[PDB]
């Protein structure tokens, strides 16, 4: 418990959504950090070099989740609870379209320009992006689908289901390569590497899965019954980050030794880790967004290089 | 079909060529098929 996590004067000015922050994310380059929140749903982009917000864009409805397609801030896709998909170019709003049924989560396959919609239907919608035409559907044969993820290493698509079964599909030829069986539904699904996979459950269990073996390599159980929203992987220290509303748990990939735990004042909607840094970004049920720095986990980010001197 | 309840496949003009296919896959195609056959207990 000798980790001495610090909490943050103002690294970025006006890092403050009016009431709450729904989702926090970072770009591939690391130049831009994006956040969305209630009220008057906004998309606010903060430049790391300038330590200020680049722009703020109000939206019609609350955004469940968004994906940064471009390397920079130019191209963003928003999913709405009103079945609305909004595309944003560098200028601003570009186009808006509907999805036949409500969408829980979506993932984009960078090869072939196919974006997959997982929602309140048995079928998982596919939208080709080089040609605007909607592609042929794939039938998952499950009443409700919760989450989806795409493997970067070899392009494998897996969708979570309400029955608790993970079904793996192939983006090429659109056939079901395999299926996995494991009452609680799948809260979070994450791919790490070629061969490692993680399943989150609403009861509060983190199950690490190998693609080749049905049995889980390791299981970690949150004592609270709250579901875990986000599961993240940190390669350098082999630390797996599992986050729920009450607390954030960071533990080792092998043998399940716990690194440290952080409990904030308010519940977390989302958590984010800046690449190759000990800095942690959290979105809370508070106008402020929490910023935490762990010196042990990694060095300070380059744009915040003086933080190491300040400690 | 009302309010876009039923999916329609008309071409979308604004979405045309919105992105370019970019792929970084380390696994060769032969390795993928062998891995896919052996997934889980199969």
């Amino acid at each position: 418990n000798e980790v001495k996590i610090y909490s943050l004067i103002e690294l970025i000015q006006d890092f403050e959504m009016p009431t709450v922050c729904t989702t926090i994310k970072v770009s591939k380059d690391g130049q831009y950090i994006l956040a969305t929140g209630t009220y008057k749903p906004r998309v606010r982009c903060y430049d790391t070099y300038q330590l200020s917000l680049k722009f703020e864009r109000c939206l019609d409805s609350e955004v469940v989740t968004f994906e940064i397609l471009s390397d920079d801030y130019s191209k963003i896709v928003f999913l709405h609870n009103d079945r609305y998909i909004e595309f944003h170019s560098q200028s601003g709003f570009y186009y808006k379209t509907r999805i036949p049924k409500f969408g829980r989560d979506f993932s984009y396959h960078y090869p072939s320009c196919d974006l997959y919609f997982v929602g309140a239907s048995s079928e998982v919608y596919r939208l080709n992006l080089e040609q605007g035409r909607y592609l042929n559907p794939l039938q998952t044969d499950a009443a409700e689908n919760n989450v989806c993820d795409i493997n970067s290493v070899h392009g494998l698509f897996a969708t979570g289901t309400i029955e608790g079964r993970v079904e793996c599909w192939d983006p090429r030829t659109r056939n079901r390569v395999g299926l996995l069986d494991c009452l609680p539904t799948i809260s979070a699904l994450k791919f790490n590497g070629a061969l490692t996979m993680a399943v989150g459950t609403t009861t509060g269990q983190v199950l690490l899965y190998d693609l080749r073996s049905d049995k889980p390599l390791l299981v970690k159980d949150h004592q609270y019954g709250l579901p875990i929203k986000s599961v993240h992987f940190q390669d350098s220290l082999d630390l797996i980050l599992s986050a729920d509303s009450r607390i954030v748990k960071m533990w080792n990939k092998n043998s399940g030794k716990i690194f440290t735990s952080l409990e904030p004042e308010h519940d977390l909607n989302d958590v984010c880790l800046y690449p190759n840094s000990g800095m942690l970004l959290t979105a809370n049920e508070t106008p402020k967004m929490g910023i935490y720095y762990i010196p042990v986990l990694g060095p300070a980010p380059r744009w915040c290089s003086f933080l190491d001197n300040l400690t | 079909a009302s309010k876009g309840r039923k999916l329609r496949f008309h071409v979308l003009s604004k979405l045309l060529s919105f992105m370019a296919p970019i792929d970084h896959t380390t696994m060769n195609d032969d390795a993928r098929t062998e891995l896919y056959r052996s997934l889980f207990g199969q």
Partner: peptide, 11 residues
Amino acid sequence: KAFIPPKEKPI
């Protein structure tokens, strides 16, 4: 015609 699903071929 508007509801007929397109068929794609593997390249």
